[PDB]
A paper describes a structure:
The human nucleoporin Nup98 forms fusion proteins in certain types of malignant leukaemia, is a critical component of the permeability barrier of the nuclear pore complex and is mislocalized in cytosolic deposits in Alzheimer’s disease. Key to these Nup98 activities is its large FG-repeat domain with a high number of FG motifs. The most aggregation-prone segment comprises residues 85–124 (named Nup98FG85).
To gain insight into the molecular organization of cohesive FG-repeat interactions, Nup98FG85 was allowed to aggregate in pure water. EM revealed the formation of well-defined and mostly separated amyloid fibrils. Using cryo-EM, we determined the structures of four different fibril polymorphs (pm1–pm4). Polymorphs pm2 and pm3, which are almost equally populated, were solved at a resolution of 3.3 and 2.8 Å, respectively, and are formed by two protofilaments. A leucine-phenylalanine pair (L91-F92) is located at the tip of the β-turn, with both side chains pointing away from the turn. The other LF motifs in the four fibril structures show a very similar structure. In all four Nup98FG85 fibril structures, side chains stacked along the fibril axes build glutamine and asparagine ladders (top). Most of the stabilizing interactions arise where there are clusters of two to four phenylalanine rings and one or more leucine side chains. We obtained values of approximately −20 kcal mol–1 per chain for the four Nup98FG85 fibril structures.
Numbering used by the authors:
A (entry chain E), B (entry chain C), C (entry chain A), D (entry chain G), E (entry chain I), F (entry chain K), ...: 85 to 124
Write the structure that this text describes.
């Protein structure tokens, strides 16, 4: 109720859950994440 | 209820879940993610 | 209820789920993602 | 009720859950996360 | 009730849960997390 | 009631729960966490 | 009632729960945590 | 009622609970925790 | 009623509970904890 | 009523509870704890 | 009523409860505890 | 029931049911009256 | 019930049910009257 | 009930039910009248 | 009931039920009238 | 009941129920009238 | 009841119930009228 | 009841119930009328 | 009752109930009318 | 009752009940009318 | 009753009840009308 | 009653009840009308 981010990760190897949230009445350039070199 | 991002990742190897959320009344250039070099 | 992004990733190798969301009353150039070098 | 981020991680190996939340009436460039070198 | 971040970690090996929360009426560049070298 | 961060860690090996919370009427660059070298 | 951080740690090996909380009317650069070399 | 941090630690081996709390009307750079070399 | 930090530690081996609390009207750089070499 | 820190430690081996509390109208750099070499 | 720190220690082996409290109208660098070499 | 008034998000007033489950690697072996995994 | 008034998020007024479960590796073996995993 | 007035978050007024459970590796063996894992 | 007035967070006025449980490795063996894990 | 007035956090006025339990490795063996783990 | 007026935290006025329990390794063996672990 | 006026913390005016218990390794063996672990 | 006026901490005016118990390794064996561990 | 006026700590005016008990290794064996461990 | 005026600590004016007990290794064996350990 | 005026400590004006007891290894064996350990 709000931003509910769960993770379960059963019998896993290498699991992660990243979350960002930038709330404002005014916000100059809010990033969530930086640059990615390699993905997946 | 809101932004609900779950991950389950069963018997997995290398699982991730990235989320960004930039809410404002005014926001100059909100990125979510940077540049990707390689994907998948 | 809202933006619900789940991932399951069963017996997987290399799974990811990226999400961006830029809500505003006014937003100059909101990107979601940067440049991709290679995809898939 | 609010941002509820749980993790369960059953029989797992290498599980993590990162969360950021930048609330303001005004915020110049709030990041959530820095640059990623490799992902997943 | 507020930001409730629980973790359960049953029979696990290597589990973590990181959370940041930067509330203000005004905040110049609030990060949540620094740069990541490798993820997952 | 407020930010309630519990951890249960049953039969676990290597479990941790990090939490930061920077509340202010005004705060120049409040980080939550520093740079990460390796994650998960 | 306030920030209630409990930990249970049943039959565990290596469990920890870190919490920071920096409340102010004004605070220049309040960190919660320093740099992490390795995580999880 | 206030910040209530309990720990139970049943049949455990290596359990800890760290908490910091820096309240002020004004506080220049209040950290909670220093740098971490290895985590979990 | 105030900051109530209890620990129970039943049948345990190696249990600890650290707490800091720096209240002021003004406080230059109040840390709670120093640097950590290894955690968990 | 105030900061009530109890410990119970039943059938335990190696239990401790550390608490600091630095109240002031003004306090330059009040630490609670020094550097930790190894934790948990 | 005030800071009430009790310990019960039933059938225990190695139990301790450390408490510090530095109240002032003005106090330059009040520590509570020194450096820790190993913890838990 | 009452009205629901959102700009940027779900204004549900009806019987809104979300479910995410995983029944991965799960084996239902009933001789009689078995139901497994009913996510409505 | 009463009205719900959000700008940026779920204004639910109805019977809103969220569920996330995992039934991974779970084995239901009833002879009679077994239900397993009913996430509504 | 009464109205609910949010800018940036869930203004629930209805019967809002959140659940997260894991039934991983869990084995229900009833001869009669067994229900396991009912997350509404 | 009374109204609820938030800017940045859940203004619940209804019957808000949160639950997180884990039933991992848990084995329900009733001959009659067994329910296990009912998280509403 | 009375109104609830928050800027940055949950203004609950309704019947708000939070629960976190773990029923891990727990074995319910009733012959008759057994309920185990009812987290509402 | 009376109003509740917070800037940065939960202004609960309703019947707010928090619970955290662990029923780990716990075995309910009733012949008749057994309930175990009811965390509301 | 009377009003509650906080800046940085829980202004509860309602029936606020917190509970933390552990029922770990605990075995309820009633023949009749047994309830174990009721944390409201 | 009277009003409660805090800046940095819980201003409870209602029926605030905190409980922490442990029922670890505890065995309830009633033939009739047994309740064990009722932490409200 | 009278008002309560704190800057840095709990200004309770209501019926504030704290309890910590341990019922570890404790065995309730009533034939009739036994209650054990009622921590309100 | 009269007002309570603290800067740094609990200004209780209500019925404030603290209790800490341990019922460890304690065995209640009533045939009729036994209550053991009632910590309010 | 009269007012209570503290800077650094509990200004209780209400019915403040503290109790610490231990009922360890204690065995209540009433046939009728036994109460043991009532710490209010």
């Amino acid at each position: 109720t709000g931003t509910a981010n769960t993770l379960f990760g059963t019998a896993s190897t290498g699991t992660s859950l990243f979350s960002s949230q930038n709330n404002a009445f005014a916000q100059n350039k809010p990033t969530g994440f930086g640059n990615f070199g390699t993905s997946t």
